[PDB]
Amino acid sequence: DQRFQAALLAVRQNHAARVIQSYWRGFKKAREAAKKKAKKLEKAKAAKKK
Amino acid sequence: MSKLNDKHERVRARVREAFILFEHKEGSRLVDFKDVPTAVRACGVNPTAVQMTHILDQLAALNAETDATGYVGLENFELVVCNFLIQQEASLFRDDYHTLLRAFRAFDPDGRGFIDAESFKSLLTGKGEALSEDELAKMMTVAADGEGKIWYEDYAQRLANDGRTI
């Protein structure tokens, strides 16, 4: 009984881990893209002010 | 039919904007292959490494018919990413907050409302698509508070609020 319950818990935890890893990768890449866009906008504003 | 056409138009516009954000040169209509996974993820989805591999292979196969300059054309990138985004949105309505809440509850059988940072990192090290130590450190710095507890509800809300304007 304990082995069956542990196997089910391990399977669901593996699925959740894959989902969370994918979502964290997406979040990190989105944050990097947002920072890159913010830096480019600041550069454009600085160039326009001259 | 009009609603579905507007859906296609929105998907194409968002993919085009993400491609423009990652163009190697302004107006060149090209994106570096190493930046293709990042551009696809910035196109508004959070797919797994398997889907990264699938999309990269599809774009490489499409580019094989053309000159192998190492850059992905705007047309091919838009087609592949728009098709993948349509597949994702049609197969599942992106209830990302609730999906992440269920995934985090899978790690909290007792329903304590929080997950230990060290135990969660140890589980993620050997479960699923294994991440790097730098990725884990950045994740725990972003999420874990001063007491080392990860409030998964707030963390999932922050993850789902990653600047994705729907």
Residue (of B14, B34, B13) closest to B24 by Cα position: B34
Nearest CA in chain A to B158: A27
Name the percent of chain A in helix, strand, coil, to the closest 5: 95, 0, 5
Kindly list the residues from chain B whose CB atom is less than 8 angstroms away from the CB atom of residue A14. Answer: 127-128
Resolution to one decimal, Å: 3.1
The residues on A that touch B, with CB distances below 8 Å, are 9, 12-34, 36-37
Is A34 exposed, middle or buried, given 0-12, 13-18 or 19+ CB atoms closer than 10 A? middle
Which residues in chain B are closer than 8 Å to A34, comparing Cβ atoms?
163
- What's the alpha-carbon Rg for chain A, to the nearest Å? 22
Instruction: Give the integer Cα–Cα distance in Å for B26 and B2.
Output: 33
Experimental method: cryo-EM
State the Rg of chain B over Cα. Answer: 18
Shortest CA gap A8–chain B (Å): 11
